Write a protein that binds this ligand. Structure first.
Ligand SMILES: *[C@@H]1O[C@H](CO)[C@@H](O[C@@H]2O[C@H](CO)[C@@H](O[C@@H]3O[C@H](CO)[C@@H](O)[C@H](O)[C@@H]3O)[C@H](O)[C@H]2NC(C)=O)[C@H](O)[C@H]1NC(C)=O
Ligand SMILES: *[C@@H]1O[C@H](CO)[C@@H](O[C@@H]2O[C@H](CO)[C@@H](O)[C@H](O)[C@H]2NC(C)=O)[C@H](O)[C@H]1NC(C)=O
Ligand SMILES: *[C@@H]1O[C@H](CO)[C@@H](O[C@@H]2O[C@H](CO)[C@@H](O)[C@H](O)[C@H]2NC(C)=O)[C@H](O)[C@H]1NC(C)=O
Ligand code: NAG
Ligand code: NAG
Lengths: 49, 35, 35
C-alpha cells in the first residue's frame, strides 16, 4: 500500500511501480528504474543477505 | 525493454490546431488550382 | 464556477510563429492570388 496507509485509508499499489515514486522523490526520473528493474532487484536481494 | 508496457495511441497536440488548418493549409493549395 | 475570475486574452506562443510561418504560407498563398 505504499505510505498511503499512514495518512488515511489504505490504497494498494504494485510494488514494481512503487519504487518509481521513491526514485522520483530523490532527483532521478522514474524511467531509470524500469530500465534496470532486474539489476536493482538483484542488488537489493544480495545486500539483504 | 520495460516489463508490462501496453499498446495505445498518444494524441499529438499540434494536430488539433493543425487538423483544422489541414482544412486551411491544404484547401488553400486547392483554393487556387481550380480557378 | 470560479469566484473572482477576470477577463483577459492568452496569446498562444504559436502566434509569432503563425505570423512568420502560417502567414508566410498565406503570403505565399496571396502571391498566387493576383495571377
Ligand atoms: C467576460 O466576457 C463575457 C463575454 O463578453 C461576459 O459575459 C457577458 O456578461 C453579460 C453580463 O451583463 C451578459 O449580458 C447578459 O445578457 C442577457 C441577454 O442575453 C441578459 O438577460 C442579462 O441580464 C445580461 O445583461 C452577456 O450575455 C455575457 N456574454 C456571454 C457571451 O456570455 C462576462 O461578463 C465578462 N466578465 C466580466 C467579469 O464582466
Ligand atoms: C553499474 O554497476 C553495476 C553494479 O556493479 C554493474 O553490474 C555488474 O556488472 C558487472 C560487469 O559485468 C557484472 O559482472 C555484475 O554481475 C553486475 N552486477 C549485477 C548485480 O548484475 C553494471 O554493469 C554497471 N553499469 C555500467 C554501465 O557500468
Ligand atoms: C503491441 O504492438 C506491437 C506492434 O505490432 C506488437 O508487436 C508485434 O508482435 C507480433 C507477435 O504477436 C509480431 O508478429 C509483429 O511483427 C510485432 N509488430 C512489429 C511492428 O514488430 C505487440 O505484440 C503488441 N503488444 C501486444 C501485447 O499485443
Ligand atoms: C480562398 O481564398 C479566398 C480569398 O481570395 C477566401 O475568401 C476563401 O475563403 C478561400 N477558400 C477557402 C476554402 O478557404
Ligand atoms: C511570388 O511569385 C513570383 C513568381 O515566380 C516570384 O518571382 C516571387 O519571388 C514570389 N514572391 C515571394 C515572396 O516568394
Amino acid at each position: 500500500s505504499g505510505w498511503t496507509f499512514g495518512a488515511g485509508a489504505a490504497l494498494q499499489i504494485p510494488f514494481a511501480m512503487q519504487m518509481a515514486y521513491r526514485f522520483n522523490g530523490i532527483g532521478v526520473t522514474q524511467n531509470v528504474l524500469y530500465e534496470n528493474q532486474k539489476l536493482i532487484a538483484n542488488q537489493f536481494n544480495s545486500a539483504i543477505g | 525493454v520495460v516489463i508490462g508496457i501496453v499498446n495505445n495511441t498518444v494524441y499529438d497536440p499540434l494536430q488539433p490546431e493543425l487538423d483544422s488548418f489541414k482544412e486551411e493549409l491544404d484547401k488553400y493549395f486547392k483554393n487556387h488550382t481550380s480557378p
